[PDB]
Amino acid sequence: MPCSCKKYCDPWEVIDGSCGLFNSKYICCREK
């Protein structure tokens, strides 16, 4: 996956959506 599901992003990555079941997690994709 180019993107990645995490509760919070990386110092080099930024949010892009909401993953998980009740959207609890976030679809964080690379800062490009």
PDB file of C-alpha atoms in Angstrom:
ATOM      1  CA  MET A   1       0.000   0.000   0.000  1.00  0.00           C
ATOM      2  CA  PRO A   2       1.489   3.453  -0.952  1.00  0.00           C
ATOM      3  CA  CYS A   3      -0.548   4.925   1.926  1.00  0.00           C
ATOM      4  CA  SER A   4      -0.859   3.453   5.477  1.00  0.00           C
ATOM      5  CA  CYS A   5      -3.481   3.142   8.250  1.00  0.00           C
ATOM      6  CA  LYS A   6      -2.330   4.481  11.656  1.00  0.00           C
ATOM      7  CA  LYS A   7      -3.948   6.249  14.661  1.00  0.00           C
ATOM      8  CA  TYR A   8      -1.454   9.069  14.034  1.00  0.00           C
ATOM      9  CA  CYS A   9       0.958   9.780  11.161  1.00  0.00           C
ATOM     10  CA  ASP A  10       4.746   9.776  10.860  1.00  0.00           C
ATOM     11  CA  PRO A  11       6.902  12.976  11.048  1.00  0.00           C
ATOM     12  CA  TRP A  12       7.191  12.561   7.241  1.00  0.00           C
ATOM     13  CA  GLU A  13       3.603  11.345   6.587  1.00  0.00           C
ATOM     14  CA  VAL A  14       0.232  13.210   6.790  1.00  0.00           C
ATOM     15  CA  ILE A  15      -3.447  12.177   7.195  1.00  0.00           C
ATOM     16  CA  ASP A  16      -5.608  11.489   4.122  1.00  0.00           C
ATOM     17  CA  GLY A  17      -8.697   9.588   5.394  1.00  0.00           C
ATOM     18  CA  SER A  18     -10.195   7.414   8.170  1.00  0.00           C
ATOM     19  CA  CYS A  19      -9.493   3.655   8.429  1.00  0.00           C
ATOM     20  CA  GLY A  20     -10.581   0.974  10.921  1.00  0.00           C
ATOM     21  CA  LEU A  21     -14.164  -0.014  11.767  1.00  0.00           C
ATOM     22  CA  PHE A  22     -15.802   3.106  13.269  1.00  0.00           C
ATOM     23  CA  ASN A  23     -13.200   5.263  11.422  1.00  0.00           C
ATOM     24  CA  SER A  24     -11.220   5.204  14.705  1.00  0.00           C
ATOM     25  CA  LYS A  25      -7.951   4.822  12.765  1.00  0.00           C
ATOM     26  CA  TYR A  26      -6.691   7.248  10.074  1.00  0.00           C
ATOM     27  CA  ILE A  27      -5.650   6.627   6.462  1.00  0.00           C
ATOM     28  CA  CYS A  28      -2.342   8.443   6.544  1.00  0.00           C
ATOM     29  CA  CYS A  29      -0.573   8.790   3.171  1.00  0.00           C
ATOM     30  CA  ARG A  30       2.965   9.997   2.327  1.00  0.00           C
ATOM     31  CA  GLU A  31       3.728  13.722   1.951  1.00  0.00           C
ATOM     32  CA  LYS A  32       4.391  13.840  -1.818  1.00  0.00           C
TER      33      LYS A  32
END
